[PDB]
């Protein structure tokens, strides 16, 4: 058991690191490691469950193993379908992040900047604060009142929303305020 | 072996659920389960490592187990110290969330509302958008330009920042814009 005790000791050490540090804003290396572990967990779990089904104590455990195998396969398929839909609608690598389900796309500086959102909004605000664009609380970069993007989109796995600029305002010191309101929720995908 | 194969099958099923669904904006029941699992996983890992050290194959494995036990104890103590400092600063239950380290406190409706922040800032903006206060992208509640909070704080484990209202502006339709700028980073704790 001394060999197995050491192996089960290191089994839990990886479990401590993934639940405490492996987050997108905390540690990107451990976040990527968590993604690799998550992508490798499904086939191993499915194979282990079908192995427990074929080598079973009794027919009750066989049925339990079959049900658990179906459940893990359902989780695998659901994750892949949702991620592929979101990637087809936004073409960003945030689509494979299990934490996020809503993504904001902003065309700025000749590129599109994807950031996650917590809630789906009917109207989205923006501030400048001395020439530093800040949409929905996200620090995007340097921008002017006259250089504001004309149209942004918010993409999820089921629908794609379109937003347009309206109701700008200027204050002293190259600072301002703007609003983006939704006008279309159809026209899915790009 | 069939008994252990079923147990190692259910062992991985919990690992899949925690890494895919147990988040704050995601299933909160699973988030609480993840917190309980981590708090129980620390002492089990420490005890398993010290047991592998006391019953070891050779002196190499004893040293490895001792080093791993020291590492997991260090992680435990670091987590508890950081969480207790943050709770002393803000007195909120977001202090024990491993995903967050910066917290924003706003006095509104006779209470203090705590929300996490991605980055520490020198100036914080606010929008109204038809009488619905929205500070740093967080939906707080109903508020007016006249009823804006006069002072907010941003608390972390090491320091406590103080912010004050400045540079307001009103547009038509009970909407507006405000700015909060830091004036003091000392005077720790409440």
């Amino acid at each position, epitope marked *: 058991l001394e060999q197995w005790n050491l192996v089960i000791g290191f089994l839990f050490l990886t479990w401590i690191c993934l639940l405490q540090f492996a987050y997108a804003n905390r540690n990107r290396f451990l976040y990527i490691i968590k993604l690799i572990f998550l992508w490798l967990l499904w086939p191993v779990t499915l194979a282990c469950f079908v192995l427990a089904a074929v080598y079973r104590i009794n027919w009750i455990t066989g049925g339990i193993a079959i049900a658990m195998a179906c459940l893990v396969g359902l989780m695998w398929l659901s994750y892949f379908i949702a991620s592929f839909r979101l990637f087809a609608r936004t073409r960003s690598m945030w689509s494979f992040n299990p934490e996020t389900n809503i993504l904001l796309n902003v065309p700025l500086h000749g590129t599109i900047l994807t950031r996650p959102l917590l809630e*789906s909004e*009917l*109207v989205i605000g923006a501030v400048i604060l001395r020439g530093h664009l800040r949409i929905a609380g996200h620090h995007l970069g340097r921008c002017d009142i006259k250089d504001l993007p*004309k149209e942004i989109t918010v993409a999820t796995s089921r*629908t794609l929303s379109y937003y*347009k*600029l*309206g*109701a*700008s305002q200027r204050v002293a010191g190259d600072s301002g305020f703007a*609003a983006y*309101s939704r*006008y279309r*929720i159809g026209n899915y995908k790009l | 072996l069939e008994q252990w194969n079923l147990v190692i099958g259910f062992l991985f099923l919990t690992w899949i659920c925690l890494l895919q669904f147990a988040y704050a904006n995601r299933n909160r029941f699973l988030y609480i389960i993840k917190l309980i699992f981590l708090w129980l996983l620390w002492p089990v890992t420490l005890a398993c490592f010290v047991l592998a050290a006391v019953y070891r194959i050779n002196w190499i494995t004893g040293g490895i187990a001792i080093a791993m036990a020291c590492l997991v104890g260090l992680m435990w103590l670091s987590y508890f110290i950081a969480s207790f400092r943050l709770f002393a600063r803000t007195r909120s239950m977001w202090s024990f969330n491993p995903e967050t380290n910066i917290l924003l406190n706003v006095p509104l409706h006779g209470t203090i509302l705590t929300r996490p922040l991605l980055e520490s800032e020198l100036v914080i903006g606010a929008v109204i*958008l*038809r*009488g619905h206060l929205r500070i740093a992208g967080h939906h707080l509640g109903r508020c007016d330009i006249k009823d804006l909070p006069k002072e907010i704080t941003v608390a972390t484990s090491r320091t406590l920042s103080y912010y004050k209202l400045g540079a307001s502006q009103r547009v*038509a*339709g*009970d*909407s507006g814009f405000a700015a909060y700028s830091r004036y003091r980073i000392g005077n720790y704790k409440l």
Partner: antibody
Amino acid sequence: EVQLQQSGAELVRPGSSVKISCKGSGYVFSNYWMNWVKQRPGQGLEWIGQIYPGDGDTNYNGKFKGKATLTADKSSSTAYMQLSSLTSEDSAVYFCASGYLGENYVMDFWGQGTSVTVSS
Amino acid sequence: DIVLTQSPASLTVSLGQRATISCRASESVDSFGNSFMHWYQQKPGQPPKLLIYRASNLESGIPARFSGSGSRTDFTLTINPVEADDVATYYCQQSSEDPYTFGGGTKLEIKR
């Protein structure tokens, strides 16, 4: 203060066409939507279409498609609507409306209305 | 085209009592978490004036004696302390689908 001001009353003959205008002040005219409601002398209100003057994106009711054409002019801060092949059913009062934040689902401030008479 | 039906077509309330106006719908007006039902007031010779937007929210500058409720298909507007200045016609509008439709109209009379 945000405002909208329309043209005067129009008397036209059947078979002709008329062009109603509605211009606004106090805001950025290119970032808003206008909604162009119609009210018959004895009946209720009715919706015609929308336009975004910033780029020229329009929606239509479907009944008024072909009858009503919406255009805009950013430089003079003025929007136009043209009704063609006018008949006696086209006598009504035409409004223009917009939202406070520039949205297309809420009409917050209106124009005073323009009366069109189609008779010989 | 979501058809909105109002009831009654004419209402007479004493100076002080409450007035209740109903608006139906052919389909469900509730979008992805939003109601999109609006109420207007039009005095003769004037453009309509918005009172309630998204079926619950009160318009700024409107007295607090107007209140609206309802969801899905059934919607209701209430004027609890009616006054002599409330003589007008009230409409309901939907914005969920592309062709926006208005209600029939309910003329409010006052008894004395």
